[PDB]
Scaffold this active site. Structure first.
Site, PDB file in Angstrom:
ATOM      1  N   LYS A  70       0.857  -1.181   0.000  1.00  0.00           N
ATOM      2  CA  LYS A  70       0.000   0.000   0.000  1.00  0.00           C
ATOM      3  C   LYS A  70       0.901   1.241   0.000  1.00  0.00           C
ATOM      4  CE  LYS A  70      -4.060   1.812   2.505  1.00  0.00           C
ATOM      5  NZ  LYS A  70      -5.026   1.430   3.613  1.00  0.00           N
ATOM      6  N   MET A 107      -6.708   8.323   2.223  1.00  0.00           N
ATOM      7  CA  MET A 107      -7.040   7.000   2.758  1.00  0.00           C
ATOM      8  C   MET A 107      -8.334   6.940   3.573  1.00  0.00           C
ATOM      9  SD  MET A 107      -3.321   5.353   3.642  1.00  0.00           S
ATOM     10  CE  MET A 107      -2.980   6.633   4.861  1.00  0.00           C
ATOM     11  N   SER A 148      -9.477   1.363   2.113  1.00  0.00           N
ATOM     12  CA  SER A 148      -8.506   2.159   1.361  1.00  0.00           C
ATOM     13  C   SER A 148      -7.344   1.356   0.760  1.00  0.00           C
ATOM     14  CB  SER A 148      -7.968   3.297   2.246  1.00  0.00           C
ATOM     15  OG  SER A 148      -7.271   2.777   3.372  1.00  0.00           O
ATOM     16  N   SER A 149      -7.173   0.085   1.147  1.00  0.00           N
ATOM     17  CA  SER A 149      -6.120  -0.742   0.521  1.00  0.00           C
ATOM     18  C   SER A 149      -6.583  -1.293  -0.829  1.00  0.00           C
ATOM     19  CB  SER A 149      -5.727  -1.921   1.419  1.00  0.00           C
ATOM     20  OG  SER A 149      -5.470  -1.477   2.750  1.00  0.00           O
ATOM     21  N   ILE A 207      -8.270   1.065   9.570  1.00  0.00           N
ATOM     22  CA  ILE A 207      -8.746   1.774  10.760  1.00  0.00           C
ATOM     23  C   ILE A 207     -10.284   1.750  10.845  1.00  0.00           C
ATOM     24  CG2 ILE A 207      -8.915   4.134   9.876  1.00  0.00           C
ATOM     25  CD1 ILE A 207      -7.516   5.081  12.423  1.00  0.00           C
ATOM     26  N   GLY A 208     -10.928   1.403   9.731  1.00  0.00           N
ATOM     27  CA  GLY A 208     -12.376   1.278   9.694  1.00  0.00           C
ATOM     28  C   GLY A 208     -12.832   0.140   8.798  1.00  0.00           C
ATOM     29  N   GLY A 209     -11.870  -0.658   8.323  1.00  0.00           N
ATOM     30  CA  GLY A 209     -12.146  -1.778   7.430  1.00  0.00           C
ATOM     31  C   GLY A 209     -11.226  -1.866   6.216  1.00  0.00           C
ATOM     32  N   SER A 210     -10.209  -1.001   6.142  1.00  0.00           N
ATOM     33  CA  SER A 210      -9.435  -0.842   4.893  1.00  0.00           C
ATOM     34  C   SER A 210      -8.599  -2.023   4.386  1.00  0.00           C
ATOM     35  CB  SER A 210      -8.578   0.428   4.930  1.00  0.00           C
ATOM     36  OG  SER A 210      -9.409   1.575   4.914  1.00  0.00           O
TER      37      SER A 210
HETATM   38  O1  JG1 Z   1      -9.117   6.262   7.328  1.00  0.00           O
HETATM   39  C1  JG1 Z   1      -8.954   5.122   6.881  1.00  0.00           C
HETATM   40  C2  JG1 Z   1     -10.144   4.231   6.490  1.00  0.00           C
HETATM   41  C3  JG1 Z   1     -11.470   4.981   6.427  1.00  0.00           C
HETATM   42  C4  JG1 Z   1     -12.596   3.999   6.080  1.00  0.00           C
HETATM   43  C5  JG1 Z   1     -13.939   4.709   5.910  1.00  0.00           C
HETATM   44  C6  JG1 Z   1     -14.416   5.478   7.136  1.00  0.00           C
HETATM   45  C7  JG1 Z   1     -15.760   6.134   6.808  1.00  0.00           C
HETATM   46  C8  JG1 Z   1     -16.306   6.947   7.987  1.00  0.00           C
HETATM   47  C9  JG1 Z   1     -16.239   6.452   9.282  1.00  0.00           C
HETATM   48  C10 JG1 Z   1     -16.733   7.205  10.344  1.00  0.00           C
HETATM   49  C11 JG1 Z   1     -17.302   8.452  10.112  1.00  0.00           C
HETATM   50  C12 JG1 Z   1     -17.370   8.948   8.815  1.00  0.00           C
HETATM   51  C13 JG1 Z   1     -16.866   8.199   7.756  1.00  0.00           C
HETATM   52  C14 JG1 Z   1      -7.547   4.583   6.725  1.00  0.00           C
HETATM   53  N1  JG1 Z   1      -7.175   3.416   6.200  1.00  0.00           N
HETATM   54  N2  JG1 Z   1      -5.936   3.320   6.306  1.00  0.00           N
HETATM   55  C15 JG1 Z   1      -5.443   4.385   6.962  1.00  0.00           C
HETATM   56  C16 JG1 Z   1      -4.138   4.715   7.333  1.00  0.00           C
HETATM   57  C17 JG1 Z   1      -3.924   5.872   8.080  1.00  0.00           C
HETATM   58  C18 JG1 Z   1      -2.616   6.199   8.444  1.00  0.00           C
HETATM   59  C19 JG1 Z   1      -1.558   5.365   8.067  1.00  0.00           C
HETATM   60  C20 JG1 Z   1      -1.849   4.218   7.333  1.00  0.00           C
HETATM   61  N3  JG1 Z   1      -3.098   3.924   7.003  1.00  0.00           N
HETATM   62  O2  JG1 Z   1      -6.472   5.211   7.275  1.00  0.00           O
HETATM   63  F     F Z   2      -9.700   1.378   7.378  1.00  0.00           F
END
Ligand code: JG1
Ligand code: F
Ligand code: JG1
Ligand code: 1DO
Ligand code: CL
Ligand code: CL
Ligand code: CL
Ligand code: F
EC number: 3.5.1.99
Lengths: 546, 545
Positions: A110, A159, A185-186, A206-209
């Site tokens: 990633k 992301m 996001s992956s 962090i939320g399913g990525s």
């Molecule tokens: O932020 C995300 C995933 C977000 C998935 C959708 C969240 C949608 C949401 C959730 C709660 C309220 C509003 C929207 C993320 N995925 N990977 C990273 C990440 C962050 C820092 C370093 C490496 N990876 O961050």
């Molecule tokens: F995530």
């Protein structure tokens, strides 16, 4: 006001194009020297077999590397999953530690995994032309285990999304159907591995990525407990947010690959390079156990109505597990709406989104992010007012909005304590039913491009386990049938708000697409989680090559 | 008014009185049935030998329990370290799992360790008459290992102090010298174990609270990495503060006792009872290693001037380690003033002290807290004003005041990130010198009663390792000589502010008091930390092994 952003995009596209040309050149050169190589045989080898042949010398690292490089280049044509070719990998190839557990294995990364001499843009203008000084810790460990990281793969801008487009490298497409999201996001990882262009990749979650793109693209993925692996050198958008921990983990075509990757990462090299990670070795005996399990399960979280395919996948898996001697126990973590609306959303946006928004100053906002940026930018008083107005009609929307407001440190401590207590609550609930593991639906089939950003509610299945910080992985178990797809036309959702309405349209036309289930264990029980995932894989895909 | 606080104190004192009377009755009853028992010989056995004799049946759990109970009751007369007798312990005594690693061992508990049926007052009126409804996780684990938790021991009011007085149970005294603090906030444990009334106790530590009382009372203590042990069921004043990690750990008369306690706690029972704790078993081979060590050291942190006794303790330990073949390398964590003034103070008081202050509404403020409550109550704009005025002449006081102001979640994220980066920065220094462990001074000798509250700067030696969240323990290595003590007249401090002035006076009149050094390892390396502590103990006090 976008001159800087436009310049960044122009240069990023130049670099991506130049990367792909470099890969093509190297591949053509290799093929010309090795015309008789059975490339198809090699690409279809399960990772464990590939690793065995590399360790024994039956296959050369060069053959494996250039064959995967060619395939990656080819599948990228229809998916746009590769942002950058990690140029020096051809030298790493030559110096890979011979007794490494991943000797000769090409690995995709990633884009957020820092790699020396390469940007980690996250699709943001402000990060273009800022190459990393060094490889991040997990990349160092991969190399020490003899693996050959070879590409950076695409992510949605910032992301913070379960789709996969940004204004620099553009939109990544699902390899199963070009009109579909690969998830995120992956997402670049999902598309690349899902189309056979890489045997093993690393993502973050962090939320399913890790879980969304694995499920959407029909591959396996594991999100460990947050601090099981080192996050040192991971490029992010927001720093110091610790209420909802970030996790990193493997994605691959089968469960055994995930276990090998974890086993390789959980070594003295990792623990010495990052002493903040508890030095918990991979417990092989737990992973390889074959004892009957007490499996909690639910067909729905009463928050996101499952698609017909999701529900069928869950029920069929439950039935096969029971037939195999496991005990299936109805179980649903208490207070899911609270966990999602208050704890998760509040933890992610304790500051009202201000820190996150700094990243977008002067930048384009990718359409895949929907109205996220516009909403976060609203004054706290307005978020509150709008929330009050929406509450009577659309309580779910009102709840998210109210909990995306800025607050004091005093209030953050209170929230952090509630997160701690909620974790203990669910653990107690789990122990009261004497569960070993938990089986849940996983969002699917893949949504249309640019719709995840308009279907926030659907993160319910995955984000719950970020909030709880439990290990959770996904395994493909079925594909959408004509009947599944027809039944989707009757889908209503529990709320009938815009998120429910979008999901129905977004899952239209999905016959043949992969659908997964999710496997969960308690904190630090990655081995048991993988043992359970292996069971699901054995039962639901019995012909999956060993 | 104060009728609520007065009533709480009256009730608390009655409960404490009744506990001690119950102990007295039980002890006298037992002694009459066992007139020939050599109690002195039993009380002086090192814990490992005591455990061996319990396991073999040579000593009965009853003989051990009631003999220690009698000693605890006796030593409490001059120290006031016991707040409550854990009445049901005589039942646990008869049911202790026979193969437990701590079978028959009486264990003392700092008052904040929740124990079913008993208050965890923290010396605060608002918590009086609110008994715990379940044993905390580590207490459950102790019992499953056959140990017999038997008393709650005193803490300073709110625990936010390295002294040991509160308005409910009063003031705990150092068993070496009644005019001296036993340290804190685990001060009751320090006094009880230090005087021979318990072979093993548990304390907690967020700025030095295991290490101060261990050092001041001449015993050993270990503060592990924050999440090495379960904090489930620990009563506190503030919750959800995660920038500066709280830790819990053992206190005992020798290093082997700490290692046994940690080995007993780090078992499947603990890991199942609290899945949030990483299931890292005690690595015996690391603890038992005799390989030469690369030992970083400093003789001063350039923040708190060490007392002559501290400096001698450090130098002598360093020299013995060198003679024993270890490599001693000068090492000082970068930016200590920043770590203490910005990160630690800011992390502990991110909300301006508001959450903490709620605990004191309507309560007396114990004199041992000095002006802390008075100061915390000041309006953010005033803390800022006073900080500007103090800055020219007294930068240290100004910095603390400035960093105790309330702030937003956005600012707290920034601070949390800075704490993470700072931790990696010190790790990077450590790695660049290829260190195994780190030897530092430990505050001592014991301060006069009611002075720790007015010498905040002196937490520098210990607080740094809460900020970094590294395991850190202390080992007694010497005692203050008249020579050391007379040299206090030449002590000036590095700043000359009120904290230095108070500390100078407070460390005087300490001849004969114990002085420790501090031993530090990287996160999660408790076994290595203990291996090093064991080395220090052997070299400086061979008779303990
Ligand atoms: O932020 C995300 C995933 C977000 C998935 C959708 C969240 C949608 C949401 C959730 C709660 C309220 C509003 C929207 C993320 N995925 N990977 C990273 C990440 C962050 C820092 C370093 C490496 N990876 O961050
Ligand atoms: F995530
Ligand atoms: O609060 C402390 C120790 C405080 C030591 C003195 C700090 C003095 C200081 C530091 C920085 C700024 C101002 C004052 C404490 N010790 N143990 C606990 C504790 C807290 C919760 C649960 C169990 N134990 O808390
Ligand atoms: C915070 C954990 C320790 C609490 C000690 C005081 C308990 C009073 C009864 C609490 C019952 C559950 O809320
Ligand atoms: Cl680049
Ligand atoms: Cl942890
Ligand atoms: Cl003061
Ligand atoms: F402390």
């Amino acid at each position: 006001g976008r001159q800087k952003a436009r310049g960044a995009a122009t240069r990023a596209r130049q670099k991506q194009r130049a990367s792909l040309e470099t890969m093509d050149k190297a591949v053509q050169r290799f093929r010309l020297q090795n015309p008789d190589l059975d490339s198809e045989a090699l690409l279809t080898l399960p990772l464990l077999q590939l690793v065995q042949k590399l360790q024994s010398g039956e296959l050369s690292p060069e053959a494996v590397f250039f064959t995967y490089l060619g395939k990656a280049w080819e599948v990228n044509k229809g998916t746009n999953c590769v942002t950058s070719y990690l140029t020096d990998c051809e030298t790493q190839l030559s110096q890979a530690p011979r007794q490494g557990l991943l000797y000769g294995v090409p690995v995709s990364l990633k884009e957020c995994f820092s790699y020396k001499g390469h940007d980690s843009t996250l699709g943001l203008s402000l990060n273009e032309g800022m190459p990393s000084e060094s490889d991040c810790v997990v990349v160092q460990v991969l190399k020490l285990q003899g693996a050959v990281p070879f590409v950076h793969t695409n992510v949605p801008q910032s992301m913070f999304s379960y789709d996969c487009s940004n204004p620099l490298f553009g939109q990544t497409m699902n390899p199963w159907k070009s009109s579909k999201s690969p998830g995120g996001s992956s997402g670049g990882e999902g598309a690349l591995i899902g189309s056979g262009g890489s045997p093993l990749g690393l993502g973050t979650d962090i939320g399913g990525s890790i879980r969304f793109p694995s499920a959407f693209c029909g591959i396996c993925g594991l999100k460990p407990t947050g601090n099981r692996l080192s996050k040192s050198g991971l490029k992010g958008c927001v720093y110091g947010q610790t209420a909802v921990q970030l996790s990193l983990g493997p994605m691959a075509r089968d469960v055994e690959s995930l276990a090998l990757c974890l086993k390789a990462l959980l070594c003295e090299h990792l623990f010495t390079l990052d002493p903040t990670v508890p030095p918990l070795p991979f417990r092989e005996e737990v992973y390889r156990s074959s004892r009957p399990l007490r499996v909690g399960y639910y067909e729905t979280d009463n928050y996101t109505m499952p698609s017909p395919a999701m529900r069928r996948a869950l029920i069929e898996t439950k039935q096969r597990l029971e037939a195999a001697g496991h005990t299936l126990i109805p179980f649903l973590p208490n207070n899911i709406p609270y966990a999602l609306e208050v704890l998760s959303t509040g933890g992610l946006f304790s500051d009202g989104g201000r820190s996150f928004l700094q990243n977008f100053k002067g930048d384009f906002v990718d359409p895949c992010l929907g109205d996220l940026i516009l909403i976060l930018r609203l004054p706290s008083w307005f978020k509150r007012l709008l929330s009050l107005l929406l509450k009577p009609l659309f309580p779910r929307l009102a709840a998210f909005l109210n909990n995306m407001r800025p607050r004091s440190a005093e209030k953050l401590w209170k929230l952090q304590h509630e997160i701690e207590m909620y974790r203990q609550s669910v653990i107690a609930q789990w122990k009261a039913m004497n569960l070993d593991v938990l089986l849940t639906p996983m969002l699917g089939p893949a949504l249309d491009l640019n719709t995840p950003g308009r279907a926030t509610g659907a993160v319910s299945y995955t984000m719950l386990y970020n909030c709880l910080d439990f290990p959770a992985g996904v395994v493909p178990v079925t594909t959408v049938t004509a009947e599944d797809d027809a039944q989707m036309e009757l889908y209503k959702g529990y709320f009938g708000d815009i998120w429910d309405i979008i999901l129905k349209k977004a899952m239209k036309n999905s016959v043949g697409l992969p659908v997964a289930v999710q496997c969960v264990a308690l904190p630090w029980q990655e081995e048991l989680c993988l043992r359970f995932m292996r069971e699901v894989e054995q039962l639901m895909t019995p012909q999956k090559q060993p």
